[PDB]
Structures are given as structure tokens and as C-alpha cells.
Amino acid sequence: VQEVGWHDVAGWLGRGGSMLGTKRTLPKGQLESIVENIRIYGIHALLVVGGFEAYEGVLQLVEARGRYEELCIVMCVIPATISNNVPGTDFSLGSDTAVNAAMESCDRIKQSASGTKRRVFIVETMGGYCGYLATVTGIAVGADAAYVFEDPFNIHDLKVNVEHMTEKMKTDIQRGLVLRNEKCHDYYTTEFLYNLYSSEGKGVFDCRTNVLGHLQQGGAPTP
Amino acid sequence: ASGAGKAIGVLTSGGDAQGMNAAVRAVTRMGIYVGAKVFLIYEGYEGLVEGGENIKQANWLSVSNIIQLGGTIIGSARCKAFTTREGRRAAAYNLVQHGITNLCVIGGDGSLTGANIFRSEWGSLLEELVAEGKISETTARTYSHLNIAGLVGSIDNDFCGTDMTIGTDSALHRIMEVIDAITTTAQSHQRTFVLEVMGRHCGYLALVSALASGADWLFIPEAPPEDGWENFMCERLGETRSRGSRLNIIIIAEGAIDRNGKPISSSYVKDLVVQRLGFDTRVTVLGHVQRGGTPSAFDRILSSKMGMEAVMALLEATPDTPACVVTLSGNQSVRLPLMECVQMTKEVQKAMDDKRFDEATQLRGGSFENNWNIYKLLAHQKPPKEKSNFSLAILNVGAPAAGMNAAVRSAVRTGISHGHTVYVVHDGFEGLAKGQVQEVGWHDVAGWLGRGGSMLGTKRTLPKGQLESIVENIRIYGIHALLVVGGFEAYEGVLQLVEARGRYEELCIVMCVIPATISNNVPGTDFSLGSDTAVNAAMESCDRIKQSASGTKRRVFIVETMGGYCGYLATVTGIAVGADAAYVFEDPFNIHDLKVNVEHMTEKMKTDIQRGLVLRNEKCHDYYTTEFLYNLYSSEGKGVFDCRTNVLGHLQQGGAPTPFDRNYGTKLGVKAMLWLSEKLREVYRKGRVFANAPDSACVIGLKKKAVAFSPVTELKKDTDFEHRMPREQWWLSLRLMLKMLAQYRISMAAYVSGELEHVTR
Amino acid sequence: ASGAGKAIGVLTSGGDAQGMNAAVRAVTRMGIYVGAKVFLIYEGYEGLVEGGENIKQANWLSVSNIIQLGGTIIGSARCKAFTTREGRRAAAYNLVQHGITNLCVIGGDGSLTGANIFRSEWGSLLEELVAEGKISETTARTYSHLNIAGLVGSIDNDFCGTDMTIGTDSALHRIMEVIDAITTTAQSHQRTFVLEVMGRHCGYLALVSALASGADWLFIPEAPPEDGWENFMCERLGETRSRGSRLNIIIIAEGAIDRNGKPISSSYVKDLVVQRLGFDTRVTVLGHVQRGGTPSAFDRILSSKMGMEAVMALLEATPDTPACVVTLSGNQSVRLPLMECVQMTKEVQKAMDDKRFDEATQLRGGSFENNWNIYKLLAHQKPPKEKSNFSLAILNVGAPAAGMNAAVRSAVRTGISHGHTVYVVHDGFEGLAKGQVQEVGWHDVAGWLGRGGSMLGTKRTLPKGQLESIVENIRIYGIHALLVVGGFEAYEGVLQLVEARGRYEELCIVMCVIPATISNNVPGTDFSLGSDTAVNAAMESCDRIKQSASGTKRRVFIVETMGGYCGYLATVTGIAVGADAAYVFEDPFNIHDLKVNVEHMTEKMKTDIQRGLVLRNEKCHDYYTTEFLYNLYSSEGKGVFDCRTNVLGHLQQGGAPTPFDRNYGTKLGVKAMLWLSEKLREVYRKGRVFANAPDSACVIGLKKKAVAFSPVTELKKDTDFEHRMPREQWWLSLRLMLKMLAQYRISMAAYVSGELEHVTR
Numbered sequence A: 001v002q003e004v005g006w007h008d009v010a011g012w013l014g015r016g017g018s019m020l021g022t023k024r025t026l027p028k029g030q031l032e033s034i035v036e037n038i039r040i041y042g043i044h045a046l047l048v049v050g051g052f053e054a055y056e057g058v059l060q061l062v063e064a065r066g067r068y069e070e071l072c073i074v075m076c077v078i079p080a081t082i083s084n085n086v087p088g089t090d091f092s093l094g095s096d097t098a099v100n101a102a103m104e105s106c107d108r109i110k111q112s113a114s115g116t117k118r119r120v121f122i123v124e125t126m127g128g129y130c131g132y133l134a135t136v137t138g139i140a141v142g143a144d145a146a147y148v149f150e151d152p153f154n155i156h157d158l159k160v161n162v163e164h165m166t167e168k169m170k171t172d173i174q175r176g177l178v179l180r181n182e183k184c185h186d187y188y189t190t191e192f193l194y195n196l197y198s199s200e201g202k203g204v205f206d207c208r209t210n211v212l213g214h215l216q217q218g219g220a221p222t223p
Numbered sequence B, C: 001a002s003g004a005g006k007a008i009g010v011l012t013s014g015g016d017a018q019g020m021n022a023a024v025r026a027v028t029r030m031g032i033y034v035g036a037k038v039f040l041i042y043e044g045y046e047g048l049v050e051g052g053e054n055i056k057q058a059n060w061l062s063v064s065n066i067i068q069l070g071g072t073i074i075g076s077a078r079c080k081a082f083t084t085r086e087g088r089r090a091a092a093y094n095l096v097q098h099g100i101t102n103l104c105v106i107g108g109d110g111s112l113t114g115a116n117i118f119r120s121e122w123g124s125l126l127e128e129l130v131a132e133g134k135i136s137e138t139t140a141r142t143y144s145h146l147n148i149a150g151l152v153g154s155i156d157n158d159f160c161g162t163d164m165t166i167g168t169d170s171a172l173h174r175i176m177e178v179i180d181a182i183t184t185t186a187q188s189h190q191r192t193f194v195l196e197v198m199g200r201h202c203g204y205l206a207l208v209s210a211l212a213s214g215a216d217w218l219f220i221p222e223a224p225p226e227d228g229w230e231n232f233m234c235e236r237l238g239e240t241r242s243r244g245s246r247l248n249i250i251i252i253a254e255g256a257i258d259r260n261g262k263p264i265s266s267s268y269v270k271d272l273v274v275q276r277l278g279f280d281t282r283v284t285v286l287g288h289v290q291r292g293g294t295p296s297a298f299d300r301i302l303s304s305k306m307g308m309e310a311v312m313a314l315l316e317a318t319p320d321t322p323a324c325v326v327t328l329s330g331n332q333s334v335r336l337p338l339m340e341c342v343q344m345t346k347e348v349q350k351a352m353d354d355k356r357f358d359e360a361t362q363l364r365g366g367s368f369e370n371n372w373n374i375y376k377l378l379a380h381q382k383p384p385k386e387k388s389n390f391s392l393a394i395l396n397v398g399a400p401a402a403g404m405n406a407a408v409r410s411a412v413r414t415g416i417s418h419g420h421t422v423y424v425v426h427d428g429f430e431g432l433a434k435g436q437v438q439e440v441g442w443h444d445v446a447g448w449l450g451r452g453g454s455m456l457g458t459k460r461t462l463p464k465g466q467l468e469s470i471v472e473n474i475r476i477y478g479i480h481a482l483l484v485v486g487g488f489e490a491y492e493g494v495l496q497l498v499e500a501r502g503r504y505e506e507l508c509i510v511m512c513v514i515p516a517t518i519s520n521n522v523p524g525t526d527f528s529l530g531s532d533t534a535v536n537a538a539m540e541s542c543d544r545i546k547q548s549a550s551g552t553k554r555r556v557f558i559v560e561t562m563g564g565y566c567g568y569l570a571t572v573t574g575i576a577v578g579a580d581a582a583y584v585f586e587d588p589f590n591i592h593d594l595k596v597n598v599e600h601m602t603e604k605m606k607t608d609i610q611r612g613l614v615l616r617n618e619k620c621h622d623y624y625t626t627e628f629l630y631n632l633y634s635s636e637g638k639g640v641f642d643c644r645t646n647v648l649g650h651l652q653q654g655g656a657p658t659p660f661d662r663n664y665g666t667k668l669g670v671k672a673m674l675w676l677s678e679k680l681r682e683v684y685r686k687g688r689v690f691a692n693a694p695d696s697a698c699v700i701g702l703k704k705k706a707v708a709f710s711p712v713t714e715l716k717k718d719t720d721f722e723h724r725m726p727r728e729q730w731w732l733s734l735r736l737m738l739k740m741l742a743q744y745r746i747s748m749a750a751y752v753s754g755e756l757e758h759v760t761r
Ligand SMILES: Nc1ncnc2c1ncn2[C@@H]1O[C@H](COP(=O)(O)OP(=O)(O)OP(=O)(O)O)[C@@H](O)[C@H]1O
Pocket: A009, A010, A011, A012, A013, A014, A015, A016, A220
């Protein structure tokens, strides 16, 4: 714990990531140490800027108020995560940046087939089980499909979408793009969709794969 | 051989050209690699004068994680003290206090002029210093010679002896990022975009911006407009409207003048266009933005190369050799004496002061005059009253590459200018077999500069399977010459046509390959058209990936690049991003090398540097795939770092061409068309074209110092057709710099540094 | 410590028990590993007598690729010369000519009796030899002591001091391969199958074959049938028909006799059954087939272990220690003096010659008498006039394991015999919660011995979730005891019920866990029921895979075994197949170890050996998967060998139980039921059963020497619940033997050999 001043945060606006360190560790394990440090530093309020772990940790401290008097401090959670998976908000802080980075990669990937070539790209997005990032990115980029956990899909839906893509690629649009959320399906992975689209699209279109890993994460914040 | 027992000082002065940090990093790490002590002099000649705290010895981690930073971590300052001997003597004193007999100066023309005057007075300054009693006579006989290796770091490119300076490419990136915001928009109103760029006494950035963006008009101090240009410009913009072109681009240097001394302001050009045309006219002024942003890939590679070469030049320099400027003419590293370059800069300045003003533009360099002539030629269609029976077809073959469209644009305009009947064929050799040939005009390539990929279709198919159809369509359309803009399949296809000449008389036509590919795998050139764009996209992704681990977390990223068996893209990208290792096919590696590199990564990762980055070429190894390296690094790095993976697929491919690729494709399309015309006239006899000699089928080639037409038959010896790459690639020496900058103790006795060369008048 | 400067002789004599090659291989490789010279004596005591060419020094490759071969590459012969001193002196001479003061004899009772008489006369033979002038007095004071380490290699198991002999398990594999051909078909006619087994003086094979196959009747010389057995047997076969059992099995030893000396022939038993029953009766005579086929997994492991222990015992043996026989009683290695074992063999032979004939069966060993009593008890339902209020439920929990059915069959018969009310619950704890409890009878388990998997259902679900349902069903059905046959989940579930006794009174019932799993990962035992079957299936796959190159191409196979985090299955399978390496979780390995092993393989593969084999446990490493090892071995072995991969999935699982597993599950099922009955009577008080102490919930063991009962609460200390295996596993010392047989120089000071033990009367 370090007391901070006005100019200690100077120029922190445009800096991406976290000047303060981030850790995913929940407070329940080291709850004795947390109450001790709150007592030592006289912490009367707690501002937690982070993702689902931030909300969950503040929830653990609230539930532990009954055991520890020191945890009866005002708490506030600022939802800040790529996935936009924090309850209580519509937009987690930094989801917009991830969406912008994701579409920029998808626009680049879609731009790479050129002229006559008919090609579909399976792009894998992050976001855990939260499909928000995939779906909005699919809207922004004109993706044909954004497979997400919240909309469970089986092989019947896949054949429908692949035949839909095949008929579309016979039309004058030549660059299909489907998004796959990383945790949308247990078995129908990005490799599965690559095999499916490339097999059924034989003689109509080629298929390629790009897993946007941490290309969606480290960028500076959007305005 | 090693420079032990001697100290190297590195300073930056002038405007903080982006890419300076890369040069400083390479100077520092090479200097302590070779055993020399490296001292960082902060604020430039300012801190040289005051000294003391401003001169600090550098370690390997002092220049860590700066290669992607613009500006300069050393800092630069304008000091008048270095102009006078009172402060210059203090500068010489402070160098003697640290035993710094070796100085690297990274700056503009004024910086290097000051460095030249500082060397010229170094003996006199030391004599007066010992006379005044601040240094003993002993300790002054040593340090009697000051070694200066100059690096030209500036966006201006005002130093006449030097062709390319650090930060010019990135300043051009900033300019073209702004112009692409205008041109890539779906044009709605009729509007004029006036761009003001910072060059007050050099119009090079204004020129290369105008050539890259296809500007309608250019104001530069080197060639002021003739009297009555007001009407001539407004009429040009008028016919531009009549063409249906909804956007006009005016590039105006800050130093824009008329034939007299009166400057031409961007506001004047605005109000002029508004009054006579009524177009929605707004001035864009970049200002400080030109020096901003990250350095481009070219700037990082070249700054690293020149910084390394600066150190090496500084160690092999005896008391007799003069102060040198480490620069690259073409692709070839060279050292130019500081005095001659300063003298040329003074001559061009005097010429520009209404002495030899019409003949000052030539002394700026043949590149400047050539660039301006190419710009004006491609800008406006002049009437080609000359005509020729010759007819030529332009192909795009292989994968699409950024800058194919720039090359095709220039080839079309230049061929029309020479009176040739220019055709394009879509889908490459597939369309030439299928007769997909179309005669093309001047405006049919309009706005093709900034378009990535290929406006013509591209196909990888080789001509041997449809040789009958190709000769048929050549006969039908009377194709006397064939320009093929493409990758390894372009060269191989032209080769198959040359070999097939003996069977088919119709194939005895002049052929020219412009190499255009991401992989840079075409023999007969050092850079393929669009390799620069791929490298820039690759580092941008790698920089983004490397920035994702926040400052606490220790993580290594395995990033997989394209390029086939050609490792060029992986290795230069590793230099640009400071990758620890770039695994490539041309440097075969086994599990012993992997354990060495992983242990090297582990030890490095225990120090203050927390983000590692190893690159892997897609076809470097049969078994040690990206997944293999991931498992290896993550297993052996357990308890030290985590490992992540990112296969840059077509993220390296589809981008719009970088400004280098636009200008480079522009120039090669011109040069190919010039050589096509010359060869066709040389080969036209008996009333028909009969191109049978091997010299009639060349790759345009940028090789070492100059453009060089290499016959495809001759290149067949040095071509690995199985791996689709040349056998001897110039860039394998850059691996040594890559490995050196990542602390690998590699005996780089095989690296060849550019030698002293006098300025080319 | 090392046995340098001394020579070891190894010979085989008698019938060529399969697994002799494994023992010879281990003797040779351990002998030259510890620095001693190894001499192979061909044709046994024959070549000992003639000597000369028949005694050849061994190298490492002399015993290469023989572990899977039956018979003996050394060859065996019956020689009468060794019976007489004339040839025995020549044998002592030939040993002295090579300086062989150390002899390993791998043979039957006659072989080891001859070795005993040869040691007893070694001093007298040497004295008479020097007296006759064939060796000087010097060179005879050295070699004055001959060290004998005996190995019992025979299918008979006639050597009384020893419990298990090499080839017994594989002879039983042959027998049960033939009986399974009869029993596993869909039975059509009423038929009788009389099996004549080749034991002319020992009936052990006939007995364990009868127990494993559930024979209707057994003729053995140790217990001849009572007078009038003709009628008693025929009536038994008659009620067998009335039951609807369409097949009868008669096991008749070659040495079958009546209470007088008259032998009972298989033809007589055939014609007898034909005349009185009319069943389709044919005699099967195995003959030489019993010594045929490959050695079983057990035979290969134990032959390797005893061969290694024979060498070590032969080096640590001073002039005073007597001739020893290296054997295993239970799972524990032991050394027994050769003289006492020979004396016991003579006593049993004299007893069998109508001296103490009724009391000869006990001197054969307690295991023989217990096996025969278990056989007769399980064969025919005798009327249990005793009854008890106790009732017990038999569970199958976890994955299916070969031999669960044999255990449940024995538990059912033994419980019914003791008057208990036996229930079986289908699907384990799931059914106990769901109340799938079905009272079972004698014939409901008929023919369950040879059936693999689980007739009762198996589920992995632990009882904690549905604990209310479990206590309810225990209350409903009045379950006083619980027999849980299964893997780690069986032990864990019984542990959960014991820990929940404090909450629920109904759970204070006697519990017993029979460990039954492929992985051998259950604490409290050395061999889980069905691990032997998995090992045998895994080596048979590995032998098939290793044979696929057929000596021409040289290739390495990465085979992946099951077993979870427990490496037992991989390591023993590697021993059985001569695998170069068995990577396991319990022996963590990094890339340095992998490079050592791959370079080791490469060097070996350049020699005469062409088929490499490394095993990988499925969960040995997080990152260095089977694909990783494939890439590694294939890359580093480039130009030396190719690499292939085979993931043995459920090929190791669904097989029918091996004869060991059938007999083992039979015996511990009986023993668990005996212990259940004793504990339930010891715990019955106040008119109800209340089992609260920790001793009332045990895992039936066989942990070092004999069967044990480890309380589940006590085993909780030595259980790694995260990895589902015990923390200290007995078999990690076998890794050193595995690595030594593969030329890995490993300091095996941690290996403990069996010490001298006197015979147990
Ligand atoms: N994206 C960035 N990454 C790293 N450092 C940054 C970034 N942006 C600004 N900085 C640093 O922040 C420092 C502080 O100056 P800055 O211009 O950013 O704001 P400030 O005037 O000091 O205070 P304030 O936050 O209120 O605007 C600068 O020296 C600059 O190096």
C-alpha cells in the first residue's frame, strides 16, 4: 500500500494496461492479511477497478463482514475488463478498446483475400464464456456468424450457416467472415469449423484461420 | 579486434527523429558487446557542455525496451554554447574526464556540422585546456584524437551527402496516415485537402509525400513554381473536377517559395483555391505530429544497422582517418567523410540563396531530381505526340502484395507517355492463357497508389501448362513486351517463357519481372515490393502482443510469421521488435540450440526485463513447430514465466502499402518501363521484335547500391526452386545483429561493414 | 561395491520354462553392469561338463531382444555326467579355466539339487583335480569357494522352499488360453472337456488351472480321490447337467493317482464320463504347449527382478554364506539356502511315497493347501446348516477392472457358505443410493471367473453427494457389512462413509475394500486386481508394435499407456518389453533428461539393435506429450531412425482377466469375506452391529509378504488425493532395473535386495 499524490498519476490517461499491478487472486485465501493491512493503514473505503474477479472479491469481503469488523468499509467496483463479463454494467472499462482492436484485425484479415479469390476466415476472439466481444465485433465487421456460448449451436446450425455461406460466396460477395468465441463450444473448436467450412466449401471457397490472441488486449485505450 | 579499454560516447541533438532510440540502443549494446565503455550524454551538446551528471555509463538494460519508442530517451537540446569555443572547450573537457575518445552523434545537419567543427578544433581545444591548467600534459597526449561517427537522425533529409536519414520513413508514415484518412474515405463532396509539412529548407518529405499520395500539386523550396502558377494550378484542379475526381491533394512545404524570395503560405493556397474553384478547402498542418508516433520498421532496422556500424567504424578508426557519416546508399552501408558532406550542405544552401538556384536541385541528389520528375510525369497526362508500334501487357502473378498497384500505375502512365499500347491482363498467367487482356488508359489506374493487394487479379499458376494459349493470345494482341509484377512464380513463369522461346517464336518478347511479394523470396533483388508493408504490419502486431503483459507479469510470446522457407520477414521483424530469437529455415537449429535459447530467455527473464518475444518462421523446422516451442518454453520456464502463442496469419498481408512500398513500386514501374522501351528499340529489327538473347528477360532488381537488371537465366543458378527462394540471400548478416542485440555471444567476424567512400559529387 | 575382477557363469537346465530368457538377460546385463565378466554356458550342465566352446563370454548385445522369447537361447540339456563325479570334476575344471567362481543356475528341482551337490563337493573336486595335475595348487586356493545363486525355472513349481517359479504364470496362460477357447463360446451341446496337464509329480498347475477355470473336478497327486470317487464325480456331473450347465471341465494331472499307487488316466476319466453320463467327452492334452508361447508379463518382470537379485546376491556372498535360491514369497524378494529347500523337496517326495501321505500336502506349502480348499469350497455348494442374521452388500465402484467378477463370485459363495445374506448392488454407490440392491445366490455368479469387466455395474460416483440415500438403503435392506471392489474411488468412498459415521449411525457397518483397477493406484496394496491383465495386454501390444519393423528398418515407437498419474503400468510394461524409457509422473523429467535419452537411443540405434521403444504414461508431463516426444525423437534421430506413435487406449482395459487376476481375485474375495465374518462377529454386541473403530473399515492388502488389512483412515496419510495414488509406492525401485537394462548408468544404491531367510518349516 503506497499513498499517492496528484502528480503520481500524471499522464496515466493514454497508458494501456495497468500501472498498478493486476492479479486475479481472490481475497478469501489471504483474508487475515487483508484485514490486517486495512487496520494498519486505516483504510476506510476500497475502490476496486477490475473484471469479474474484482466484483467477486468485493463480494467475498462483503460476505466476510460478519466475521471481521474491519471489512465493514465502503466498497466500490469499477468494472474494467475486455470480456464485458462483469454484472451490474453494460460496458466494462476497456471492452470498447478490445472491440476496436478486434475489428481492426478482422478488417485487415478480410482485406487480405483480393480480387477474384473467394475465401472465408474463421477468426477466434477472446472474452471467456461471455460472447459480447464476439457478437459486437461481428456486427462491426459484417461477420456472417459469431458463434458464442450464450447461443448454443449444434451441427444442424453449422450446416445451415455453411450452406448459407456457400450460397453467398456464389454471389458477388467473395470474403466471408465468421467469428468464434474462444469458449463457445466444447467440441466444435476453431479447427473443427476450419475443417467443416473448408470441406463443404470445396470448389466454392477456401478457408483460413486466425486466432486473435492478445492482439485484442494490450492496446492503448480508445478515446 | 575488440575495443576494450576505450570509451564510446553517444548523444542525440536536434529535432528528435523517431528511430533515434533504436540507433542509441544499437550503439550502446554493440559498444558494451565489443568491450568498450558506453557513456550516454543526455540533452546532446547541452549535456556535453555541462557534463557531470549528464554523462552516465550505460549497461545492457539502460537501452532496454526503447526500440519501439519514438523521440529519444537520451533527450536532445539546442545549445548555443557548442557554437562558441567557450562551451566547446568545456565539452572537450567533459569528454576527457571520462576518457571518451570516441563520440557517436545522432542528429541533423547542424548537429553533424557542430561535430565536424568539434573534431577540427579538438587538438586546439585540448592544447588551450592544458595551457589553462584543467588537464595535465600527460592525460592530454592520450585522447589527442577524437573519433566521430555521425548518424543522420532527422525528418528533414537536409544532409546532402546522405540519401536516407533516420526518421524520414516514419515521418512519411505519419504523413500518409493522415492522407489515407482522406483518400480511403468514400468521397462525397467536391473538396480540396491542402497538407502543410514542416520542411522549411528541404522539400524532400513534401516530395515523397506527393509521390506517395499522388498529389495534384507540390510546393517545395528546391523547385519553386514558375510565374503565373496561380492560374496553372487552378486550371489543373479545374480539369481534375471535370474528370470527376472529387478530391484534390495539395502538398505545400513550410519552406514553399516562388521564384523570388517571397514564401507561399498554405493559407494563401487555400484562399486561392476557394476563390477560383469554390471547393471545400481546408488546410491540414501536421506540426509536431511528423516527429511523433512509433518508428517504422525500416527506421528500426536501419537505425540498428547504422548504430552497430557506427560503433564498428569508431573502433577501426586510426588517428589519420577522418570523421565519417555512417549511411546507406541504396541497400549498401557506406561511410562518407563528415567534411565533404558538410561542404556539400553548405554548397546547396548557398545555391538555394539565389546563386546557382536553378542548379541547386541537382546538388541535392539525383534521387531528389528523379523523384520530382517521376512525380510530375505521373501527376498530369501530357500529350504524347510520339507513337510507337510497340504494345506491352502488364501481369500480376503469385500472391497479392502491397505496392503491386503502385507499380502497375506507374508502368501504365510511363508506357502511355512513351506511346506504347499498354494492356493489363487479369488473373496473371491464367488470364493471359484465357485471353483476359484489356487495353488500359491513363485514368484507368487512377488512385491505385494507396490500394493494397491487386487491382488486377493475381494467380499463382505457371505458364508451362497453358503455353499454347499464352502464345496464342500474344499473337492475337500483338504483345511485344511483358511486364510481370509478382513473386517467385512471376520470376519462374518468365523463366519458363524464356526456356520455351526455342519452341515458340512468339515468346521471343522482351520480359521484365518486378518482384512483388511478402516473403522477399524472389532472386535478383534485395527487397521485394510489399515486403516492407508486411514487416511493418508484423512488428505492429508483435508490439501490440508484447505490450499485453502488464509490467508485473513475466511472459514470453511465440509469434509465428509467414514468408515460406524465406526467413527474411521473421528476422527483420525480430530486429524491429527486439525479439530474443527468430527461428528460420536458413539457420537450422536443433534441440541443443533450443535449450540454449530457452535458458538464455529464462536468465534474462529473472532480470528487470519481463516480456520475451521469440519469432518462428512458418516453415523453419519440420518438427519443432510453434506448438513445440510453446510446450518447450512453458515447461522449462515453469516458475519463471508463462508462455503464449500467436500465429500472425494474413494480418501481415492485406494492409495498404506503406509509403516506402508506394514510392518503391512507383519508381520500379517507371524504371521497368524505361528499360522495356530501351530494350524493345534495341531489339526491333527487320520490321519486327525478336527478343532471343537472355538479356531481354530481366528482374528489375534493387541490389546493394543500385537498380540492376538481372537476366532470369543467370539467376537460375542462384535459385532454390524447391524452397522457392534464392540460395545466397544478402540479409543473413543481419542475424548476427539480431543475436547480438539479444546478448547471444556470436563471433560476428562474417559481418562486413561499409567502407569509406567519397561523396558522389 | 562393484564386482570387478570376478566372473559370473549363467546356465539353464531342465525343461525350458518360458521366462528363462528374461532371467538370463537380467543376469548378464546386471553382471556386466556391475563390472563382472559374464559367461554363457550353453546346454546347461552338458556344456558345463564338455566346456570349451560351450562357455562363451557375454556382452550387452548377446542377450538383446530375447525377453519376449520363450524357451531359452542358452539351451538346456539333460546330462547324466553331472550326476557322477567323473563329469562333475570336469565341470569344476571348466569353471576354473575361465575363473568362474560365481554360478547362476536357472532350472527346476533336479537342476538346483545338482547345483547343491556341486557346491558341497567343490572343495573335494578341486582337491582331486589338483592332485591329478590338471590345475596347480596356486590357482586352486583362489576359486576355493564356488558361489551358487539358484533361480527356480520350471512350470512344475515342485521346489518346496519356493512359492512361485519362473514359467508357472505363463504355463497357466497357455492352459487358460485353451480353456477360454472352450468356455467363451456359446455352448450348444452337453459336453465334457477333460484337460490333461503335464504335471507328472506336482499338481500345482492342475490346481491353479482348476481354480482359474472353475473346474468341476480335479485329480492331483497331492490329494488323490477317496475310494468310490467314480460315483461321486459322475453324480456331481449329473447335477451339473440338471442345473442346465452345458459344459463340464475336468482337470487331470499327468501324475493323477488314487489312494493306492495306481495312476488315473485321462482316457479312463473320459470313458467313465461317456459310459455313465453320455456327454460329448473329449480329452485335451497340452503336452509341449505348456512350455510354449511368450512369457507372460509377470514372468518377464519377476525373471528380470530375480536375475538381477541373483547377480547382486552372488557379489555380496562371502566364503561362509551358503548356496541360496533367489525367489519371491508374496511380493517380497527373499533368499533361501539351497540345502534347506533341497531337504524339503526330499521330505515331500518321501512323504508322497506313502510315508506321511495324508500330511504331504501341507509340506508342499500353505498356499497349495489353501488353494485346494478354496477350489473345493467354490466348486460345489455344500449345505450351510449354519445361519447368521448378518447381511452384506457387494459393490463394484470406479472403472471396470479384470477380475472384479472373480472377486464377487468368491465373496458370494464364501458369504453364503457362512450363512450370510449376500446382496449385490449394481452401479456401485449410485445403485446403493438408488436402492439397486438385489439378493444373490450361489449360481447367480456362475461362470463369472473368466468374464472381464464387471457383471455388476461400475460407477465412479463418490458416496458423499447421495449419503442420505445410502444410509436409507442400508437401513431398508439391513446391510451389516459392505464389500467394495474397485479402484481409488472405492477406497475414497469407503473413507467418506467412515468419516461420516459420526453423523449417521447406520454407516457404522464393517467395510472392506478390494482394490481392483488397471492403474494399481489404490493405497494399501501392491497389486490392484486387474493390473496384471492390463500389463499383459499392454506388453502384447508393445511386442506387436515392436515387431512391425521386422529387423530391416530401424525405428523408435512412442507408446502411450494409461494409469492416470500412477506410473506403475508404464514402468512394469517397459520392463516386460525392454523399453528404453518409461516416462512417468513419479519421476519428473525435463528437456535435459529428454536429450540424454534421445542421444542414448541414437547411439544404441547405430549399433545392432534396430527397434527402439519408449513408453509414456498418459499424465507423466503437462507439456512433453506423446506428440512432443514424437517430434523430438524424429527430429534428433534424423538420418538414424524414424519415429512412430501408438496411443494404447482401451486396448489395455476390456480384456478377460489373466489367470493371475482370476486366482488373485478369487483368493482375496474369499479372504475379504473371512475377515468380514470375523470382524462382524467381533463387533456384534447389544443385539446389533455397531462398527465405529477405524479397524472395521480396511483395504485388503497383499502389501509386502502376505495379505494385510489396512484401515482406510490410516491409509489417508499416505494417499495423494489430488493425483489419486499413494504417496509412497513400492515399485519405484523397479525403475532402476528398467534403466539399468537399457544401459543407463544410474547409481542404484537405493535398491534393496531380499536377505537370507530360513524356510518356514
Ligand atoms: N501512452 C503512454 N505511454 C507511456 N507514457 C506515456 C504515455 N502517454 C503519456 N506518457 C507519459 O506521461 C508523462 C506525463 O506527462 P503527460 O503529458 O502525459 O500529462 P501531464 O501534463 O504531466 O499530467 P496530466 O495527467 O494531468 O495530463 C509524459 O512524460 C509521458 O512520457
